[PDB]
């Protein structure tokens, strides 16, 4: 599956004049298919780090493309961050505040939902110990991403292991 | 409340939720960098620079647009002042008060206020020596204080 999506990514430069100066430049680290509720499936892609502003620059006329150059199921795009285990009881190694679980998962939150801009969060603590991260997105850019919301939650359960639901003001 | 009065006001600024720059802000990080250095070399401290960029050039906050605090911008380009801004202004006010005081020696309200301002100067200088923004030997003379500023 890595290589069939590699092939699908490898040749869109033919035709679609307007997509030039974007994809002559960028390999993906990995891409994996994952199952969302209802026997629907979806796919996740991992751009390493340096080109996340490139993808986020466009992220629309090519995300549609992989639903027309792939045309089976949904795709999402995130940028791979390294998470470091917390430094041992004092070891004189400070761990900059990036590459911290909190900051990294907030990055994956901000990028999984990239078209919209995050406008609020809430963390609910259910009675028996379940935890829910409800997120409010900008009310504009709403008919772009309302059907991948179940997909977005399925994505977040994979690489961060959290129960997030989304909603609008 | 206030450190040297009984006032309890809560008037201050409230930054928005949204960290990212607004949709309508199109200016690029290098141009803002250039404006900051240009105003700095002209003699504007980070507060005046921020007021300028808020008012004329439609920059809400530099840290949202450029990702770096304006003082850090001035430091990276070697343009931060030697005496930090708030201590600079406290020193200047203390000098003004003392200059007024030699002309009115029975004005005891201003003597009280001079004590309060020097107290604030000493507390902020303690902070600055502790955090290595001043030499560990900087000390404040009543006599030779106008030479440093203005």
């Amino acid at each position: 599956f890595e290589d069939t999506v590699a092939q699908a990514f490898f040749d869109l430069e033919n035709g679609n004049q307007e997509l030039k100066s974007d994809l002559k430049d960028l390999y993906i680290n990995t891409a994996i298919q994952m199952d969302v509720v209802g026997n629907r499936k979806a796919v996740v892609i991992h751009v390493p780090y340096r080109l996340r502003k490139p993808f986020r620059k466009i992220h629309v006329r090519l995300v549609r493309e992989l639903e027309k150059k792939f045309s089976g199921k949904d795709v999402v795009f995130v940028a791979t961050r390294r998470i470091v285990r917390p430094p041992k009881k004092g070891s004189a190694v400070q761990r900059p505040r990036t590459r911290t679980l909190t900051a990294v998962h907030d990055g994956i939150l901000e990028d999984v939902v990239y078209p919209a801009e995050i406008v609020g969060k809430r963390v609910r603590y259910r009675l028996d110990g379940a935890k829910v991260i409800k997120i409010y997105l900008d009310p504009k850019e709403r008919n772009n991403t309302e059907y991948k919301l179940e997909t977005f939650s399925a994505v977040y359960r994979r690489l961060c292991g959290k129960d997030v639901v989304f909603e609008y003001p | 409340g206030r450190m040297h009065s009984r006032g309890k006001g809560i008037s201050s600024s409230a930054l928005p939720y949204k960290r990212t720059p607004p949709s309508w802000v199109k200016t690029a990080v290098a141009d803002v960098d250039e404006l900051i250095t240009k105003a700095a070399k002209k003699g504007q401290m980070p507060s005046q620079i921020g007021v300028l960029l808020r008012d004329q050039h439609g920059i809400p906050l530099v840290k949202s647009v450029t990702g770096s605090k304006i003082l850090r911008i001035l430091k990276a380009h070697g343009l931060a002042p030697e005496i930090p801004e708030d201590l600079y202004f406290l020193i200047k006010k203390a000098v003004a008060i003392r200059k007024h005081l030699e002309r009115n020696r029975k004005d005891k309200d201003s003597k009280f206020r001079l004590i309060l301002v020097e107290s604030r100067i000493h507390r902020l200088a303690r902070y600055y020596k502790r955090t290595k923004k001043l030499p560990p030997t900087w000390k404040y003379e009543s006599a030779t204080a106008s030479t440093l500023v203005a």
Partner: protein, 128 residues
């Protein structure tokens, strides 16, 4: 002038004593959340939410009408697994119910789980 987990618990006692259903704690911390988890798992509060606008934080708690008093032991004493007994006699209404909350290197937990896991720590507060 602030040392939180006192303002949170005392706001909750005041709100519960007035019969309010929702209480709001302005400054939050992991310590407060960990305490509130013990409260919920032992049954004295309903579910609660973290509201992050950005800052220290904010939370809203749902009050079930069964808590009588929850307070802090500021000046958190050092508390070993043998003098648990005498603190709970000094501080709880009976041998049958009520919990003392202790922070321990195995997390924040009530005194009974502390007895079972055989760890002491420092006392944070109590609720009953």
């Amino acid at each position: 002038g602030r040392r939180i987990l006192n303002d949170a618990l005392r706001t909750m006692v005041n709100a519960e004593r007035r019969g309010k259903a929702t209480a709001q704690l302005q400054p939050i911390s992991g310590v407060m959340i960990s305490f509130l988890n013990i409260m919920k798992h032992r049954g004295y509060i309903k579910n609660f939410e973290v509201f992050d606008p950005h800052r220290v934080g904010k939370i809203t708690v749902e009050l079930q009408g069964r808590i009588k008093d929850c307070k802090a032991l500021t000046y958190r004493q050092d508390l070993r697994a043998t003098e648990i007994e005498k603190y709970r006699t000094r501080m709880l209404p009976t041998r049958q119910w009520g919990y003392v909350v202790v922070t321990t290197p195995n997390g924040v937990l009530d005194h009974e789980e502390a007895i079972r896991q055989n760890v002491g720590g420092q006392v944070l507060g109590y609720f009953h």
